[PDB]
Amino acid sequence: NAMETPLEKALTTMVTTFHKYSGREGSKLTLSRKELKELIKKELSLGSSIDDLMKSLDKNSDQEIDFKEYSVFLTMLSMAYNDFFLE
Amino acid sequence: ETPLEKALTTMVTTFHKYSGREGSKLTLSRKELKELIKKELSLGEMKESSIDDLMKSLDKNSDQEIDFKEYSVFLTMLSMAYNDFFLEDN
Ligand SMILES: [Ca+2]
Ligand SMILES: [Ca+2]
Ligand SMILES: [Ca+2]
Ligand SMILES: [Ca+2]
Ligand SMILES: [Ca+2]
Ligand SMILES: [Ca+2]
Ligand SMILES: [Ca+2]
Numbered sequence: 001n002a003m004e005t006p007l008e009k010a011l012t013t014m015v016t017t018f019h020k021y022s023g024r025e026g027s028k029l030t031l032s033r034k035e036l037k038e039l040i041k042k043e044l045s046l047g048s049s050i051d052d053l054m055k056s057l058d059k060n061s062d063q064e065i066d067f068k069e070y071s072v073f074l075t076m077l078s079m080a081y082n083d084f085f086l087e
Numbered sequence: 088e089t090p091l092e093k094a095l096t097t098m099v100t101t102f103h104k105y106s107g108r109e110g111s112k113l114t115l116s117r118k119e120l121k122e123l124i125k126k127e128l129s130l131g132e133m134k135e136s137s138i139d140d141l142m143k144s145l146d147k148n149s150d151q152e153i154d155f156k157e158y159s160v161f162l163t164m165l166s167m168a169y170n171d172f173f174l175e176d177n
Contacts, residue, residue, distance in 0.1 A: 007101050007127045010094035011162065015170050017091045019177070043091040067170050074095060075159045082099045082155045087107070 017043055018070050030064035044077070101127055102158055114152035117142050128165075 004012065021039040022031045031039065033054050040046055057069045065073070105123040106115045115123065121138050133141075145157045153161075 005127050006097055010097040011166050011169055013090045013094040014166055015173050043089050071163050071166055078095045078098045085099060085103060
């Protein structure tokens with residue numbers, strides 16, 4: 001939909017990126033650690049601290065990252081750039 | 088460079104496009120929040136009553152400014168809304 005604003009397209013990409021990787025194993029509604037790392041490896045530039053990331057994110061302790069837990073991860077990455085924003 | 092990386096960059100630069108217009112360059116006034124919503128989201132014009140309520144819900148420290156952390160709660164409302172749409176659609 002070309003008529004979506006730049007922000008709308010961004011938010012859409014955040015949502016589709018989750019579901020692109022959550023449907024590889026297990027529930028398609030959640031990311032396993034394997035699935036998380038594969039989104040991290042392929043979609044981000046972050047190349048034992050995953051499993052620590054995994055734990056910080058898994059607020060319900062169910063071993064899986066759902067959409068609300070992934071949104072917190074995205075905000076972490078956003079804030080890291082916002083902290084040092086130079087106009 | 089990835090779509091997801093450009094998306095997160097957009098979250099930041101959009102905030103700053105409007106937060107730097109007046110007052111603190113790092114926070115959105117009520118004016119700046121209303122202008123962000125008007126321009127950067129499609130249709131659905133927000134009434135003054137609606138801006139008030141969203142302002143008061145986001146402004147957890149009552150300084151009448153929306154900082155990036157408070158603004159991140161709004162982005163999540165929008166993501167969550169589209170997630171529900173994507174789930175139904177798929
Ligand atoms: Ca899965
Ligand atoms: Ca979980
Ligand atoms: Ca979380
Ligand atoms: Ca401002
Ligand atoms: Ca926009
Ligand atoms: Ca505030
Ligand atoms: Ca907050």
